[PDB]
Amino acid sequence: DINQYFQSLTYEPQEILTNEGEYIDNPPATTGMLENGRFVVLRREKKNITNNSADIAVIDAKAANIYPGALLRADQNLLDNNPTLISIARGDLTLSLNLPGLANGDSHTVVNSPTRSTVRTGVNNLLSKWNNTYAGEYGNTQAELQYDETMAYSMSQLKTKFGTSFEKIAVPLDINFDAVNSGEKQVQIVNFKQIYYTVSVDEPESPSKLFGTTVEDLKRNGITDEVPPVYVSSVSYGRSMFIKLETSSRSTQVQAAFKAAIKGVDISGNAEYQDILKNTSFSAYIFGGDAGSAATVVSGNIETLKKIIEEGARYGKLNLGVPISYSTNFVKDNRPAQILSNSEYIETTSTVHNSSALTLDHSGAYVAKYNITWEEVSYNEAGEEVWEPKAWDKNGVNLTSHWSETIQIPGNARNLHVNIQECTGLAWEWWRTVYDKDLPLVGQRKITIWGTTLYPQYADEVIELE
């Protein structure tokens, strides 16, 4: 009996579907740079990404050996999203057609001598029975949106976020890891899946029910306690769109910007910082819907992306789609074949700190002592902050009657303090403090003292730029 042998099969499913790989070392200590009156704080930290899932998203419509009820081997091939098919005498099995939100549809059909052709035929009579009357030919309300976003930092971490095919779409996607690492550009990758339907296979009550003259014709197909058999349980059909979004923006509101952008929820309206969207250059690898043969690569601009997703969503059809994701189960215990994958990577985040301008104006019938101070950030080795004391070069200096000077506090500065005093004709209170405050490093700030020795009057004003 086969079931007995299947029950005797002693393997470790999870350990045979594992993807290690760290090779991360240690990232160069965080540093600080000066660029065009701005301060660039570069901080890159070592992180780890993990992905354990039995839902395999496809990529190459040609490298597809996937179909509902497909009997596949459980090996490195299956692990690398390039499984091996076991073409043996197949046992009749029942297939069902699941739709996103079609109430109680779930059309069922029987399948004899299971194979690409037969399954294709079943799915054909299904989809045909569906399109024949139901108003769901070109589009169907809201197909299942499977949105998988992630900021790009490492080919491997992307290989973990999507699998071992992003290595295949990498060239078309054109990702700038060097730039991201340098901190120049910022790029997010988004797996936008748009499932129109989903073919399900009735869980085999028994391996015997799956495969009756199959006495021991298993060892002649590659079945062993070393190479367990799996079967494609569910296959999702729709439009798969792997989009790459690059922008020269900073590390502020980017995620939200991109996500909201891709989701296209009229974010444009009341969009505080939309410079990212005005600087969103994209490149998308799409397949499904528009065609059931080849894929399409489109590089361009934010708008082009919007109109491309909008014209790619409800412009396709339902008649016949392409496999964009699938799932398989072990033949023995019908356990979900959950591929695991780990990957350490480097998250590189930079921060811009603008210059600061402090104008000083003296209009007093007297002599005014000036005294302004602050501290500057120094990023030495070990990536540890080093705040260094700084004071105005003319500090302690006393200015006569009228004076004026604008000062340029660097971006890597903080804890600004201003202290200005005025000389009085008094011997007891020779010096009278006029102004003394801790000040925020706002864009532009003008401080104007003026008036009489017996009465000094000041003015602290703040201005903007652009």
Ligand X SMILES: OC(C(F)(F)F)C(F)(F)F
**Using CB under 6 A as the criterion, which residues of the chain lie in contact with ligand X when the complex forms?**
286, 290, 296, 298, 308, 311-312, 315
* Residue 349 beta carbon to ligand X: minimum distance, rounded to whole angstroms: 33
Q: Distance between CA atoms of 345 and 365, rounded to whole angstroms? A: 64
* CB nearer to ligand X: pick between 68 and 288: 288
Helix (H) or strand (E) holding 213: none
Q: Distance between CA atoms of 314 and 324, rounded to whole angstroms? A: 17
Beta strands in 294-412 (DSSP E): 296-301, 322-330, 339-354, 356-379, 385-391, 398-409
* Residue 241 beta carbon to ligand X: minimum distance, rounded to whole angstroms: 8
Question: What pairs with residue 34 in β-bridges?
Answer: 39
* CB nearer to ligand X: pick between 308 and 449: 308
* CB nearer to ligand X: pick between 309 and 357: 309
On whether the CB atoms of residues 234 and 201 are closer than 8 A, the answer is: yes
Q: Distance between CA atoms of 372 and 390, rounded to whole angstroms? A: 9
* Residue 165 beta carbon to ligand X: minimum distance, rounded to whole angstroms: 19
* Residue 308 beta carbon to ligand X: minimum distance, rounded to whole angstroms: 5
Residues 6+ apart with CB under 8 A from 87: 71
* CB nearer to ligand X: pick between 214 and 296: 296
How is the chain split among helix, strand and coil, in percent rounded to 5?
15, 45, 40
* CB nearer to ligand X: pick between 70 and 309: 309
* CB nearer to ligand X: pick between 315 and 455: 315
* Residue 61 beta carbon to ligand X: minimum distance, rounded to whole angstroms: 13
* CB nearer to ligand X: pick between 74 and 143: 143
* Residue 290 beta carbon to ligand X: minimum distance, rounded to whole angstroms: 3
Q: From the CB of residue 400, how many other CB atoms can be counted at a distance below 10 Å?
A: 12
- Closest residue to ligand X, judged by C-beta, is 290
- Chain gaps in the chain, named by the residue before each (C–N > 2.5 Å): 211
Please name the residue ranges forming H helices in 188-251. 207-210
Structure tokens at 55: 């839902």
* Residue 312 beta carbon to ligand X: minimum distance, rounded to whole angstroms: 4
Residue with tokens 């950030």: 377
* Residue 295 beta carbon to ligand X: minimum distance, rounded to whole angstroms: 9
* Residue 255 beta carbon to ligand X: minimum distance, rounded to whole angstroms: 25
Q: Distance between CA atoms of 420 and 399, rounded to whole angstroms? A: 10
* Residue 446 beta carbon to ligand X: minimum distance, rounded to whole angstroms: 53
Distances (CA, A) of 345 to 49, 160, 161, 187: 7, 11, 12, 15
Residues 6+ apart with CB under 8 A from 74: 13, 16, 17, 227, 228, 229, 230, 330, 337
* CB nearer to ligand X: pick between 287 and 379: 287
Helix (H) or strand (E) holding 252: none
* CB nearer to ligand X: pick between 42 and 318: 318
Strands 18-19 and 339-354: parallel
* CB nearer to ligand X: pick between 260 and 297: 297
